[PDB]
Design a protein around this motif. Sequence first.
Motif: not given
Length: 134
Positions: A35-39, A57-59
């Motif tokens: 939920x934190x991430x910029x896509x 950065x995660x997926x």
Amino acid sequence: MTRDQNGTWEMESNENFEGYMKALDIDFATRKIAVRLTQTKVIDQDGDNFKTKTTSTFRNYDVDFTVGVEFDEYTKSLDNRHVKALVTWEGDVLVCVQKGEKENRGWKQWIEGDKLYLELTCGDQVCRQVFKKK
Ligand SMILES: CCCCC/C=C\C/C=C\C/C=C\C/C=C\CCCC(=O)SC[C@H](O)CO
């Protein structure tokens, strides 16, 4: 004539991504990071042929399709489900139905002004994403 979605797109908002992920049964630990991430979304479009690469950065998640051609979609490293997906045009809005074990699953993606809008639906949860062109 706003069907041209080519470009590199940076997320500027992500409304109710938490609820959408919960509707997909994503576990709490995965949701807490995601939920934190910029896509970022790269769309390579040749008429009705699309290649999309969405990154964080995660997926990362890639999906390719031709508008009007049903395809098998495996949402690898997201909720890891198999669906039958169909993308169609409704006016200049790209509309995807993802038929499978989750009811009312799909997404809609369109251009307005200089922004790309992506609304992801699962059940009674809608996530609204807005991207600015890089
Ligand atoms: C990949 C980055 C995800 C970070 C969160 C990680 C894990 C959260 C786990 C699951 C959340 C589910 C989906 C992620 C939402 C959107 C991703 C894109 C899906 C598309 O392809 S939509 C159509 C495309 O736009 C066509 O052009």
